[PDB]
Amino acid sequence: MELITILEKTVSPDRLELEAAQKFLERAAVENLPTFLVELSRVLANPGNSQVARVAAGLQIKNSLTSKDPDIKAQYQQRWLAIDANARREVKNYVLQTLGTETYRPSSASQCVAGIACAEIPVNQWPELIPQLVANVTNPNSTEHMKESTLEAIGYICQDIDPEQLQDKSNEILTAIIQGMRKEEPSNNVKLAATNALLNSLEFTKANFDKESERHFIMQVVCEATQCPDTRVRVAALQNLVKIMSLYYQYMETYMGPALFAITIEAMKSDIDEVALQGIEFWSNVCDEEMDLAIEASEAAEQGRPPEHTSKFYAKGALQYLVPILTQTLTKQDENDDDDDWNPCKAAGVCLMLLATCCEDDIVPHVLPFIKEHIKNPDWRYRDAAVMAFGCILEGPEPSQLKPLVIQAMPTLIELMKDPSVVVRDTAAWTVGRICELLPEAAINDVYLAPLLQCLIEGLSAEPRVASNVCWAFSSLAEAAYEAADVADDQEEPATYCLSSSFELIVQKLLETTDRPDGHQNNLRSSAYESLMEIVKNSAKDCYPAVQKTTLVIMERLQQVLQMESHIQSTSDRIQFNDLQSLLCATLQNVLRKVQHQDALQISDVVMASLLRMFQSTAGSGGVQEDALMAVSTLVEVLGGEFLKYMEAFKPFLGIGLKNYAEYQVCLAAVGLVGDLCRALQSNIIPFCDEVMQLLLENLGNENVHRSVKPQILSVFGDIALAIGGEFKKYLEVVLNTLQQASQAQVDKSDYDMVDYLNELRESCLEAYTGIVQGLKGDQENVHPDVMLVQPRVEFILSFIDHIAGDEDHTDGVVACAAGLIGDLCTAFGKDVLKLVEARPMIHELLTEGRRSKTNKAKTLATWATKELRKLKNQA
């Protein structure tokens, strides 16, 4: 039956026809890919076919050739490259002739071309594509539709396919796109399609980007495009210019003066949202890359080397024009303001923040008059502008130069705190929160502290859109109280603080706002609790009964947590269920770290039962169960040697904990938790060591797990030896053989992430080797005979660090833990290793930078090692 009828049906509004057509298409493509694709290409190539059917065929071919999931794309490429070359060429010709025969504005065949080329180029089965497209572009007889279809296909090509496979054939494509970029083209559609294509292709223009003439011609083309009356071409050329800026900051100095900056400011001055927004985006990208180059210059200066790239302070020279227009457009707010939609106003705000970061102290004289004049205007627009600018420019200059202004303007700020206009109140709350976050010295002022604190205290009862902001302001005040309190009252712990004088007042109110029905709005429920963690943290010794009281309250929430296992009705409800558990589980460990051991004993029993049940109730959604076990671990870090009463009801829970083998995150803490048990249970884990150690090798054997977990298994390996001492003899011979392979594993220097991946991998190797050495050695007696079992392997380990000593990536941690081996082995053996180390000379230079390494822990192990050799040489 006619497949054109299928194409018509798969666009008509009927679910049954859609699913039936999709099933037929998939079944026939799987059964007979070549014939089906040939028939589809022949059908779509016919100009006389209905445009709807042609679009349907194009989208179906795109779906068959490409999809969202990368692995499905890869397997479909492998399926496609196995088709015989005759049908390949036939469909190539059919799709090539299809373009130019469609009245549709976008080319449905562009997606098909992209899909076929996706595996054509890597196998190089379609080398005539570039000359074919060049001829299509250069043909004078070519019509609008043919040109735009070719341009769209080229854009999809340069968008989807891996950039490396197009490296060799870039020059002619760039030549074709530039020849098709001539402004003499009467249709704007061709210009916009070419602009989309080139902007999506810039990732490999370096082949033709070097030439001065080509660069000038391309830039003149884009500059003339920026003058086109059509605004879509305006925005396309502006985005293209933005991406050039993001790519080639080195050379734009030759051209900033003539055209670029004038076009950018003209784009800003436009009343149209899009053009102005693109101008903001361009200048913000300039700002960000100026940050990156400033960072590079700082690294070069501290290193003494000349930086690879050099900046010229573009924003420093442009701020004099940037400030007034940005400030003016800051006032374009709307009464029915929203936050889900990006607007020119918030773009102006973020751009102003970035410019303030870049210019340091060169913004204050250029913005102070506006805020000073418009902080008191009767209309809320200009007051909003002034207060938001005052908040946004808060960073960049040193606090000392800003102190007089903030200290003399704070009364005005608490004045605008109270005005009935909601939007200005919201901005005022944000400003005071940020002013507390950045500079605390001005926030601490009893002349103003009590009135402003009271004001925000009643303000938190208002709508959530200000409640969340004022809650974070409370949190900011909390860590400010910390930072100025640990220096004010005592060092080991605060005894009594000024904010703490009203601590009982604020804390219960946070519970009230926690129970607000609108807590879901503006993340209020997650607002108080995060603020709650910090405010409970700032518990001076006089606040102890207060924090005991809220502790007496919190388990009731957990007692509540026991009792809605039947009200899970929606995924969002389950999501909110999942969200609530994560915060609550963090709450105890937040508060359990600042209580008394005796006070922890009574709550320990009820805590365990609550934690016992919830690990199994939520079998699915393991993300929250990640937070569970470290919360249980926190009990171990405080309960200590009284925790042994629960292992008999903990071992199966630990077993199922590591029984996932799918998610690394759960085992990430699981290997940590057992590592935490050793530092507390000490030698009492020996009966339980057999079960976990056997389980541990199983995770070692399974290679399906990620690579980042692998160092962690080595992390627990070292410490368990210390906990059990010499009992590790039974499993001793196993680990070195397993560790021999991982240590001997090596890779090239291509990807930095795996270079750092091996860095922590070798790092874990070193600490594990120390742990077994320390465990077999004992505590106070001489070297135990248990160390002889690893003696033959010490030379190979010395060779492993030799290769690491030859490595060039390096980090403070890598060298530091490296020093641990020599100190441990020298204590372990002494004479036996003196000759062994002397065979390798590169260790002597490795310790030289150890003395130079800035990290104290690096230095300590560095000096720990070197002094050990000295006594050994002088021993004999």
């Binding site: 918030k346 944000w430 993340n523 720990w864």
Partner: protein, 43 residues
């Protein structure tokens, strides 16, 4: 692209809080670990 994360206080999401909590946890664990190692090895 969408750089909204620097706007207002939108940069406070549950995922961000989770990652902050776990990184503070890992620094605490590391500090305890090398503390114990330092006391038991030598001053």
């Amino acid at each position: 692209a969408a750089r909204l994360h620097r706007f207002k206080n939108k940069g406070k999401d549950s995922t961000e809080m989770r990652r902050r909590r776990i990184e503070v946890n890992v620094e605490l664990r590391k500090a305890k670990k090398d503390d114990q190692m330092l006391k038991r090895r030598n001053v």
